[PDB]
């Protein structure tokens, strides 16, 4: 990507005008003109830079806990790692209701600052929160660089590395999002959770396909 002649989605079909090629992982793919509006593009870009990032962390977990449960290490599979008893705390024991409320409360604070800067750039960088200013500024939409969000300084360093890194993030994030639908759809058909599904497919690769799983192909 990052080019006027960037590889496209359907070789031959011309790319959309709004999709110039600058945006990370741009392949001119908007068939239903969902991002026809420029403001819509900015919002959609931010949203993708939000779903993919969470999806990437979520995929890392469903794979690490799964790898553990397969090796034997006591790890509840992603599907049953919610009914697992909540751990105690020095303050006290955890309650599901409090846990949900605390999770939303904290998220509301961060989401507000992120969206407020998205709507008003640099709004958060007003030393209002303990004097943190530039660190609360946004290098780009979906790129909140600083000395609190990009500590190592990939963005502050070589732009080419930063740009390359931006492509890695978009491509990996899109893969993680697709992978996540898998983890869920393979569960809601096989009932086993990944790393067990990879292990079954590597033990009888020809007779362990989606076709032979009861739910995928109904007649077969």
């Amino acid at each position: 990507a990052y080019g006027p002649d960037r590889p496209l989605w359907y070789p031959g079909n011309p790319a959309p005008a709004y999709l110039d090629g600058t945006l990370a992982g741009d392949y001119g793919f908007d068939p239903l003109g969902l991002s026809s509006d420029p403001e819509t593009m900015r919002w959609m870009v931010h949203a993708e830079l939000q779903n993919a990032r969470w999806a990437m962390l979520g995929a890392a977990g469903v794979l690490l806990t799964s790898i553990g449960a397969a090796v034997g290490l006591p790890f509840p599979e992603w599907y049953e790692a919610g009914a697992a008893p909540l751990p105690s705390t020095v303050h006290g024991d955890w309650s599901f209701g409090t846990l949900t409320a605390t999770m939303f409360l904290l998220f509301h604070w961060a989401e507000q600052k992120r969206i407020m800067d998205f709507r008003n750039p640099g709004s958060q960088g007003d030393g209002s929160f303990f004097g943190i200013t530039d660190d609360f500024k946004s290098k780009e939409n979906g790129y909140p660089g600083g000395r609190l969000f990009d500590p190592i300084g990939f963005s502050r360093g070589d732009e080419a590395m930063y740009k390359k890194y931006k492509q890695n993030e978009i491509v990996n994030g899109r893969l993680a999002m697709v992978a996540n639908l898998g983890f869920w759809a393979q569960y809601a058909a096989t009932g086993k959770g990944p790393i067990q599904n990879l292990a079954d497919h590597l033990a009888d690769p020809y007779h362990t396909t989606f076709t032979t799983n009861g739910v995928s192909v109904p007649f077969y």
Binding site: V71, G153, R156, G157, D158, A199
Partner: protein, 226 residues
């Protein structure tokens, strides 16, 4: 300039001034100049701590081969209570670390004896306090020896820890076990992951090691990914 991989091209940020520069930044971490300056302080501090540690682990195995370095704290009788030793250690380390950092923050500010203003460390480069009663050879040559020796030590420590998790002995005992059956003690000879099978080395470290009646959680680094 010697490079980590002959024929490679050193990244622009590594023009080479920091002692022991070999144009090695495959991921471009120290791209930010200030970030590289910090990483430089981290590299030296890590190396010096690791160099003392690796040496101590080896010595504490020549002198007292019984106590295992990994569980030494639980196998040794502290002259003072851990709480008291930890308390003193915290304040002691806190003081040196603060003055040490203040120099990196504002160079040449803590370069004086606070109790006796008469005493004052001469002007010096960051990362090099000035304690150089004896320097055997060119300063830069000795600097390269310090970073090369330090980088080797840091790698050795991870080796000491991992070997102590795969096997249940220290560096000298593990090396001897290798010297005994060289072609059957390697990690390959004790752990193999095939496209269908997963043989991982047993963790010889109890998940929790009780200390003075307080079980201390001792996890085997990523025991799940071996």
């Amino acid at each position: 300039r010697p490079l980590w991989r002959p024929g490679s091209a050193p990244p622009a940020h590594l023009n080479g001034e920091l002692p022991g520069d070999f144009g090695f930044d495959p991921l471009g971490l120290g791209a930010n100049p200030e970030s590289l300056k910090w990483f430089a302080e981290s590299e030296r501090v890590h190396a010096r701590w690791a160099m003392l540690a690796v040496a101590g682990i080896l010595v504490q195995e020549v002198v007292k081969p019984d106590v295992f370095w990994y569980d030494a704290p639980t196998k040794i009788d502290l002259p003072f209570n851990i709480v008291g030793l930890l308390a003193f250690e915290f304040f002691a380390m806190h003081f040196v670390e603060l003055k040490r950092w203040q120099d990196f923050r504002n160079p040449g500010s803590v370069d004086a004896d606070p109790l006796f203003p008469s005493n004052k460390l001469a002007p010096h480069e960051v990362g090099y306090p000035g304690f150089a009663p004896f320097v055997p050879g060119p300063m830069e040559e000795l600097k390269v020896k310090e970073i090369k020796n330090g980088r080797l030590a840091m790698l050795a420590f991870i080796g000491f820890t991992m070997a102590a998790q795969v096997t249940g002995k220290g560096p000298l005992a593990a090396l001897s076990e290798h010297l005994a059956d060289p072609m059957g003690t390697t990690i390959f000879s004790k752990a193999v992951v095939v496209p269908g099978q997963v043989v991982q080395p047993e963790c010889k470290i109890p998940q929790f090691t009780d200390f003075q009646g307080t079980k201390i959680f001792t996890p085997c680094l990523f025991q799940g990914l071996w």
